[PDB]
């Protein structure tokens, strides 16, 4: 049986729980679920309604367009998820008003053995539920979506990569280097000879230099956040001189 | 029949095309697909393999861990999608090395009637395919995922909101205001009386003031990017004075 010491449980509150098949049935995350490294358990506010038409939205006070999620079914779904999780589960709401997710934030979230993710729909949820039920608000980026399910799945995928057993250049805060595979020549473009050389140290340094160059050209602000090693300073200076020559 | 003037077509290249049911079968985006406002068409590199085991990965030159997507099946899938799209389709690769997506970038991407989204798996794709097949590289945020499918779906959801007919505070670059619905009192927390007043102008100003205050407290850098109106300057100064009193 598969070693699952640091397994993670994620409860999800969603009006569309079948969306989560996209991560629980496919690829690396699908394998993680099958092997009990990751468990994703969903509760649907619709199931906590009592009226004949299973109403899950409600009108905002102060008017204006759009609906909000109805409080009672959503609150009851959240409470049921909390009771299942037991002690220690952090409840997260996904929205553009939340803390912006980045890889550092992913590594922080990955320290939790249990998370509950609340997925908003319509124009969102009652502010007082954020006050009374939510521990942390997070955003996956500065854009607006129709639902919090894709943000929740994005978060789950990102943190799952840190669960031991789930995997077979962002680690040092740099963009990735270019990668090449067969064929050796593709529409006249050749693989850099260093990658064919079998010189492991030259390859390492080429890849690091490329990561530094790419970060400098595309995302220079990311370099400001780093304390570069002597080697990294040298390779970046080399890259900048070559770019400039 | 449903007015579909500015309909959008999105071609997707993915080893897991069934993931896209999460947006094509549910909610607002699901309705958009059913009503022909949005079309999502998928091609799977696996279908373009010729060997007995339908191999879709390949070893990176220069070694190191991980595999890349195999060039020939992926390239052939991309070419097939391009031929289906005909003239004018922008081909996008999703990766952390791409231009960071924000709502302005969403509105730019939404001007395209046709997009093709290439979803990487494994450690990614050959750099020369980016050179020869990809028009633009985009990132949904500074974090690493197991696949480009969730980024692609995130992009599709975000741009779909701009298609006329798909919908029933980021517009001015501010965070959203708090929203309230029934009941009037929730765990001792009351709805702000202004929202019950029926005074449309006071409600508008309260909501705007809240958006300004929330943006200032949580995301002050976002204010630097705005040219505030006289009213917005006044309401922000009011909010800051109250916070400080
Ligand atoms: N950028 C984000 O992380 C994000 C989260 C939720 C969302 N929409 C939800 C929240 C309110 C109702 C739909 N859009 C965007
Ligand atoms: N932040 C992003 O937009 C993003 C895109 C693709 C991805 N992973 C893919 C790309 C390389 C192979 C898997 N991770 C993250």
UniProtKB/Swiss-Prot annotation, chains A, B:
One of its GO terms (molecular function) is tRNA (guanine(37)-N1)-methyltransferase activity. Keywords: Cytoplasm, Methyltransferase, S-adenosyl-L-methionine, Transferase, tRNA processing. GO terms for biological process: tRNA N1-guanine methylation. It comes from the Bacteria. It is an enzyme of class 2 (transferase). Transmembrane segments: none annotated. It catalyses: guanosine(37) in tRNA + S-adenosyl-L-methionine = N(1)-methylguanosine(37) in tRNA + S-adenosyl-L-homocysteine + H(+). Its main location: cytoplasm. One of its GO terms (cellular component) is cytosol. S-adenosyl-L-methionine binds at residues 93, 120, 140-145. Specifically methylates guanosine-37 in various tRNAs. Homodimer. Belongs to the RNA methyltransferase TrmD family. This is tRNA (guanine-N(1)-)-methyltransferase. It comes from Haemophilus influenzae (strain ATCC 51907 / DSM 11121 / KW20 / Rd).
């Amino acid at each position: 049986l598969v070693p699952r010491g640091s397994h993670m449980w994620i409860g999800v509150i969603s009006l569309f729980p079948e969306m989560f098949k996209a991560i629980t049935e496919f690829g690396v995350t699908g394998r993680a679920v099958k092997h009990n490294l990751l468990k994703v358990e969903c509760w649907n506010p619709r199931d906590f309604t009592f009226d004949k038409h299973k109403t899950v939205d409600d009108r905002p006070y102060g008017g204006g367009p759009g609906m909000l999620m109805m409080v009672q079914p959503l609150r009851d779904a959240i409470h049921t998820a909390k009771a299942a999780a037991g002690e220690g589960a952090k409840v997260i709401y996904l929205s553009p008003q939340g803390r912006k997710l980045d890889q550092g934030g992913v590594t922080e979230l990955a320290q939790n053995q249990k998370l509950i993710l609340v997925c908003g729909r319509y124009e969102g949820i009652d502010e007082r539920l954020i006050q009374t039920e939510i521990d942390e608000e997070w955003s996956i980026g500065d854009y607006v979506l129709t639902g919090g399910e894709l943000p929740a799945m994005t978060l789950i995928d990102a943190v799952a990569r840190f669960i031991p057993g789930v995997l077979g250049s962002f680690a040092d805060g740099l963009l990735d280097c270019p990668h090449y595979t067969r064929p050796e020549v593709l529409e006249g473009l050749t693989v850099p000879p260093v990658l064919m050389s079998g010189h492991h140290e030259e390859i390492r340094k080429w890849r690091l230099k490329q990561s530094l160059q790419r970060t400098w050209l595309r995302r220079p602000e990311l370099l400001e956040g780093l304390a570069l090693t002597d080697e990294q300073r040298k390779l970046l200076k080399e890259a900048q001189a070559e770019h400039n020559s």
